[PDB]
Amino acid sequence: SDEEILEKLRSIVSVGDPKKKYTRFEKIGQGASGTVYTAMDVATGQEVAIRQMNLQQQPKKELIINEILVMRENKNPNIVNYLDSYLVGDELWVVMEYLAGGSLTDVVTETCMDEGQIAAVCRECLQALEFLHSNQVIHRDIKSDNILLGMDGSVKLTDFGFCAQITPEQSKRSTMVGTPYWMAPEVVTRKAYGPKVDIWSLGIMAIEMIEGEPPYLNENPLRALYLIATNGTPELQNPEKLSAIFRDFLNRCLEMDVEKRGSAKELLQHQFLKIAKPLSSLTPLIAAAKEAT
Numbered sequence: 001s002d003e004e005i006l007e008k009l010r011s012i013v014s015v016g017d018p019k020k021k022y023t024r025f026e027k028i029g030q031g032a033s034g035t036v037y038t039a040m041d042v043a044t045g046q047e048v049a050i051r052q053m054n055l056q057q058q059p060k061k062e063l064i065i066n067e068i069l070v071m072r073e074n075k076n077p078n079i080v081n082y083l084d085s086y087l088v089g090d091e092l093w094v095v096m097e098y099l100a101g102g103s104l105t106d107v108v109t110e111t112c113m114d115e116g117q118i119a120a121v122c123r124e125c126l127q128a129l130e131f132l133h134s135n136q137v138i139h140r141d142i143k144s145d146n147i148l149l150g151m152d153g154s155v156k157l158t159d160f161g162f163c164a165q166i167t168p169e170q171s172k173r174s175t176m177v178g179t180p181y182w183m184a185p186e187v188v189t190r191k192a193y194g195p196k197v198d199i200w201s202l203g204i205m206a207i208e209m210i211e212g213e214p215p216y217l218n219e220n221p222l223r224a225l226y227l228i229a230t231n232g233t234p235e236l237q238n239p240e241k242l243s244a245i246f247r248d249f250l251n252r253c254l255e256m257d258v259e260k261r262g263s264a265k266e267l268l269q270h271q272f273l274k275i276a277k278p279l280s281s282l283t284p285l286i287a288a289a290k291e292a293t
């Protein structure tokens with residue numbers, strides 16, 4: 001219902017008009033998902049990202065409430081911090097911490113990471129995923145675009161628009177929600193999948209970090225999932241360039257058999273993560289990427 005959704009958003013949000021509370025607006029985005037700005041918390045000096053939406057033209061408002069509630073109750077150092085929300089008339093505002101390091105996409109697209117930098121990023125993501133899965137949250141849309149970076153090398157998952165919450169009674173999902181190139185084969189071949197779809201996705205993201213894109217990126221999306229289903233574990237262009245332990249880490253992420261594929265908990269113990277460089281090692285790639293876009 002339209003009315004009920006508004007009453008429910010009303011209870012969630014803080015009161016009043018937030019344009020007093022934030023000063024230096026610069027639009028950095030737009031679309032059906034509304035408009036995104038960077039701004040400064042006029043009180044505390046903190047730089048924030050704000051999404052403004054008009055509700056009279058948002059299709060699936062249930063997804064919006066769900067996302068906010070999920071951010072609120074699942075805080076974690078490797079998840080982009082949800083700050084506050086506001087509702088002025090039909091205009092909903094969501095305020096998030098701002099991460100100046102850009103997206104991983106910028107990084108993989110403009111720079112070449114070494115194995116130690118990749119291990120560090122992979123470690124940080126698995127920390128997020130272990131926490132989420134242990135709380136029965138499946139992100140379902142893991143990709144470099146949904147990794148945000150701090151200037152200090154900090155690594156945070158974002159965009160929980162497509163996440164699933166599972167339960168012991170309904171602990172498996174079937175909805176095809178993720179971005180095609182990153183989707184596990186079982187999302188298309190079967191109608192039952194679990195949290196390990198995020199691990200497959202992370203594996204594809206690891207491929208991004210090596211080759212600069214996920215496999216089949218040139219192909220039409222429609223055709224990607226067919227290729228994913230039928231090729232199974234994707235091939236690297238120069239596997240021999242990789243360390244044996246990195247290759248083994250990938251094989252565990254990209255295992256066709258869900259049961260053999262590593263869980264996050266399991267993968268956090270993998271020895272590949274132990275060559276991780278300090279997160280600050282990422283700052284030169286971040287700066288360079290920033291300067292290239």
Ligand SMILES: CCn1c(=O)c(-c2ccc(-c3cncc(C)n3)cc2Cl)cc2cnc(NCCC3CCN(C)CC3)nc21
Nearest residue numbers: 036049050051064067068071094096097098099102103159
């Ligand atoms: C990519 C823009 N962006 C966001 O959209 C959000 C964000 C996340 C979640 C919600 C949210 C949560 N719960 C519910 C709802 C309904 N929305 C809102 C928002 Cl504003 C946080 C965020 C933090 N830092 C950065 N800076 C790096 C951007 C990079 C720059 C340079 N490059 C080229 C392209 C990326 N961007 C952010």
